[PDB]
Design a protein around this ligand. Structure first.
Ligand code: 9YE
Ligand code: NA
Length: 329
């Protein structure tokens, strides 16, 4: 299979001190979790239980993410990435790293965000809201990509939005990884519905552009109100659903560009499909959320060829966001 490199920020980690990306050498300092009283269960992630908590030393409201089970290398990665990204635009702020003094189980402490569940929130988003929050999410992605980091789990569940204060934070960096040119990565990342085609065809030399596919999937579901937008029942069916929209010939062109041998089971299920116009998804229930600019942006995100997808920075400059950058400057 042919090689691939990020379009932007490709060499940024090699330009930094080795200490920056050599997370296996990062040694966290573990405080005492008894400074924090757990107050409310908020939810969970793959390897965590997340609680609202009060820091009993200063009455501040925080979030405590308890890591269980525990892979040490993966904890070092999440912690180092969070420290590298601290103070980044719309990146969740890591405040502390602590351990229960009896179980020695590790926990990450974060700033509290008063999230509206996206299933309730997406029912009330306006066209302007979608442009605003997508813009804020793109700032976080441009930031973490400029810091040599792929999130690799971009999905509504990982985008906290306080709709009252109109505040956004990208969370759960436990799958995030440092980008290094020509490195082959594990493709078993992201939720099925947000996996880019590169993951679904087992192309391991991927880069920041994976997050831009996931972001296009979110944009599609918000403006069209079909959530998730590509609703596969398994990883084979996920690629078929994508191909029923972007077309099969464009899929075969991608595979030819990168010399990707396709899992032969696909021969039974892919069929042949023409590219659908994005306008075919418009109807009376989503018409108020769709515009030519939205569709043009979506078209430049949801591309098979990861190398041709917009960068986060290019997406921020797209006319779909002019109403937001006008009322923000
Ligand atoms: C007030 C409500 C209803 C939610 C506020 O949820 C917050 C707020 C601030 C910071 C974080 C979370 C959160 C995190 C994480 C998770 N959640 C939530 C979605 C349970 C779950 C996945 C793993 C993870 O890392 C996380 O870092
Ligand atoms: Na998560």
């Amino acid at each position: 299979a042919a090689g691939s490199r990020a379009r932007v920020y490709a060499e940024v980690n090699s330009l930094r001190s080795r200490e920056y990306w050599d997370y296996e050498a990062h040694v966290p300092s573990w405080g005492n979790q008894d400074d924090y009283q757990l107050v409310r269960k908020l939810g969970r992630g793959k390897y965590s239980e997340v609680f609202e908590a009060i820091n009993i030393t200063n009455n501040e409201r925080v979030v405590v993410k308890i890591l269980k089970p525990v892979k040490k290398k993966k904890i070092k990665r999440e912690v180092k990435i969070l420290e590298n990204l601290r103070g980044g635009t719309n990146i969740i702020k890591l405040i502390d790293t602590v351990k229960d003094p009896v179980s020695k189980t590790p926990a990450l402490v974060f700033e509290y965000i008063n999230n509206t569940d996206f299933k309730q929130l997406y029912q009330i988003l306006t066209d302007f809201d979608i442009r605003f929050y997508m813009y804020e999410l793109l700032k976080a992605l441009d930031y973490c990509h400029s810091k040599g980091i792929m999130h690799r789990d971009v999905k509504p569940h990982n985008v906290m939005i306080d709709h009252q204060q109109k505040k956004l934070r990208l969370i759960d960096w436990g799958l995030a990884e440092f980008y290094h040119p020509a490195q082959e990565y594990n493709v078993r990342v992201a939720s099925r519905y947000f996996k880019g085609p590169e993951l679904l065809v087992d192309y391991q030399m991927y880069d920041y552009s994976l997050d831009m596919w996931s972001l296009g999937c979110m944009l599609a579901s918000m403006i069209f109100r079909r959530e998730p937008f590509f609703h596969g029942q398994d990883n084979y069916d996920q690629l078929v659903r994508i191909a029923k929209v972007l077309g099969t010939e464009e899929l075969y062109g991608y595979l030819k560009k990168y010399h990707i041998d396709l899992d032969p089971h696909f021969n039974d299920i892919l069929g042949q499909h023409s590219r659908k116009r994005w306008e075919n998804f418009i109807h009376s229930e989503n018409r108020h959320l769709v515009s030519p600019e939205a569709l043009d942006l979506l078209d430049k995100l949801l591309r098979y060829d990861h190398q041709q997808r917009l960068t986060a920075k290019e997406a921020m400059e797209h006319p779909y966001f002019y109403p937001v950058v006008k009322e923000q400057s």
